[PDB]
Design a binder for this molecule. Structure first.
Ligand SMILES: C[C@@]1(Cc2cn([C@H]3C[C@H](O)[C@@H](CO)O3)c(=O)[nH]c2=O)CN([C@H]2C[C@H](O)[C@@H](CO)O2)C(=O)NC1=O
Ligand SMILES: C[Se@@+](CC[C@H](N)C(=O)O)C[C@H]1O[C@@H](n2cnc3c(N)ncnc32)[C@H](O)[C@@H]1O
Ligand code: SF4
Length: 340
């Protein structure tokens, strides 16, 4: 069940890097169909005679390229910067914000020029030191879910672990963490899992690991000394959400029974969606029960980007207050980093 692509593209230039060569050798040996692409920013001939088909097939397609944009995006509130190791995901979460963010590039891209990327990360760390600089590695991908193929995240973990002022963090819905358990993280990596109510997981998170799988993985990473965290997102006011999210934290507490949870973090994100995201979702997941009724939402206008629908302030406050109380009840001492 670990992700393996059905189609792989290589940029010619990727072959000049160790990871490029390694991946080319691996995938040719596996007998996977391999193609050449002139830029990972434009891949041709992904199969499908319809949009939804090419979309589905794109999500089983890997592209091995070189990161040419070495300026890092901001990644608040998670981190100062997004470290670009991969883009895209094999998951099919109905609400996924990547459907607008990566609308046109739904294939999984991994970058092979780690030397360049880690060098630039160090430059950012240097520019702010002795202030701590955090990097988010899962801004635009499930980096953990694909990493068994590349070990790029493992390399990033060990790179950051060697710095004084750098810290790393990422979040996943995948359980395939075994190759990361012996990484020399040096306590500078927060390993997070996305969790949610039974309703949201069962109806909206196909193609991801089960809740039990995520928690089995969470026990493994805490066992290996990683700082642990959870991202409760998207917080979605389904019928019976109040008891739905109560049952989440109750089951969470039961699944972490007898563990050191002295440095446990929670991050809380309410469901959000853009106007372009709606009609996109409607034809990528035509039978979803996801509610995208804008009349049940308030519009938050954009600053540098486009705006989005979130819950009205009072309903958003109810969610925040309720999650905080459950976290206080079941995980005393645990730190809620933000609600948004
Ligand atoms: C995993 C994330 C990473 C992240 C992504 N992003 C970007 C990536 C993408 O371009 C966009 C999607 O709205 O959000 C961001 O600005 N800040 C982040 O912290 C996900 N997010 C989302 C939530 C919201 O859409 C946006 C800002 O809160 O980031 C978050 O707040 N916490 C995280 O830890
Ligand atoms: C883009 Se997700 C990338 C990392 C990894 N593949 C993962 O799924 O955890 C980052 C987080 O944001 C949430 N999230 C995704 N879409 C939305 C959304 N529309 N509203 C509100 N939240 C949304 C997801 O549940 C994740 O907790
Ligand atoms: S696992 Fe994360 S990035 Fe992948 S489809 Fe789901 S929400 Fe989107």
């Amino acid at each position: 069940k670990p992700f393996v692509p059905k189609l792989v593209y290589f940029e010619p230039e990727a072959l000049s890097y160790p990871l490029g060569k390694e991946l080319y050798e691996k995938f040719t040996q596996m007998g996977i169909k391999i193609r050449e692409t002139t830029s990972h920013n434009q891949v041709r001939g992904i199969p499908g005679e319809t949009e939804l088909a090419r979309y589905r097939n794109a999500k089983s397609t890997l592209v091995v390229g070189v990161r040419r944009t070495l300026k890092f995006d901001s990644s608040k509130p998670s981190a100062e910067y997004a470290i670009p190791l991969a883009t895209g995901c094999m998951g099919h979460c109905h609400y996924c914000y990547l459907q607008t963010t990566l609308g046109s590039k739904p294939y999984i891209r991994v970058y092979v020029n780690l030397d360049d990327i880690f060098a630039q990360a160090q430059k950012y760390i240097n520019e702010r030191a002795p202030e701590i600089t955090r990097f988010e590695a899962a801004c635009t991908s499930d980096i953990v879910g694909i990493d068994h193929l590349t070990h790029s995240l493992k390399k990033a973990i060990e790179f950051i672990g060697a710095t004084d002022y750098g810290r790393l963090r990422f979040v996943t819905k995948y359980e395939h963490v075994d190759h990361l358990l012996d990484a020399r993280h040096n306590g500078k990596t927060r390993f997070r899992f996305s969790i949610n109510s039974r309703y949201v997981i069962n109806h909206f998170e196909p193609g991801t690991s089960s809740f039990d799988g995520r928690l089995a993985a969470a026990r493994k990473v805490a066992g290996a000394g990683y700082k642990l965290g959870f991202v409760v997102a998207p917080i979605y006011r389904h019928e019976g959400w109040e008891r739905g999210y109560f049952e989440l934290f109750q089951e969470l507490a039961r699944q972490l029974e007898g563990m050191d949870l002295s440095d446990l973090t929670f991050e809380l994100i309410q469901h959000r969606f853009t106007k372009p995201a709606k009609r996109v979702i409607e034809q990528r997941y035509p039978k979803t029960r996801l509610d995208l009724d804008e009349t049940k939402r308030k519009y938050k206008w954009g600053r540098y980007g486009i705006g989005k629908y979130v819950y009205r302030d009072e309903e958003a406050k109810e969610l925040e207050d309720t999650m905080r109380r459950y976290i206080e009840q079941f995980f005393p001492g645990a730190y809620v980093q933000y609600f948004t």
